[PDB]
Amino acid sequence: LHKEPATLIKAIDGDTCKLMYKGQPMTFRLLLVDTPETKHPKKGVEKYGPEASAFTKKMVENAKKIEVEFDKGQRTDKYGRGLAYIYADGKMVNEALVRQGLAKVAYVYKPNNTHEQHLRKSEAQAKKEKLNIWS
């Protein structure tokens, strides 16, 4: 995989944001994870959704540099959102949320699952420590 620079435009919630990539503004969705919902009324405001948003928001608002890393399969989902592993100063946001028990590993679609085991191992640790979602 290869990392590429991006510019933060607006953090939406725990796992979705707007970034300037390749000169064009677009919304991104974190690969392999799911932070709780805060928008869609069908799900309503789920437990830890606000917490995840705030964590993602802080993490990325103070970053000197942001990079996006696409997996080996499709780069956008059906909603037109870019699918990537996103790093804030070399720290993978997808993994940081799972490690805190603020996201579960989800939507594992081959072949976009390169860092699946890494995330699995951090989710297991968050579970054993009874963190947030696992509390």
Catalytic residues: 29, 37, 81
| Binding of residue 52 to ligand THP (CB under 6 A) | no
Q: Is 15 annotated as a binding residue?
A: yes
Cα separation of 20 and 25, whole Å? 4
Which of 14-22, 63-71, 93-101, 117-125 is the region at the interface with Ca ion (rule: CB under 5 A)?
Answer: 14-22
| Binding of residue 77 to ligand THP (CB under 6 A) | yes
Cα separation of 132 and 135, whole Å? 5
> What element of type H or E holds 83?
strand 82-88
Cα separation of 68 and 42, whole Å? 30
Site size toward ligand THP (CB under 6 A) is: 9
Binding residues vs Ca ion (CB under 5 A): 15, 34
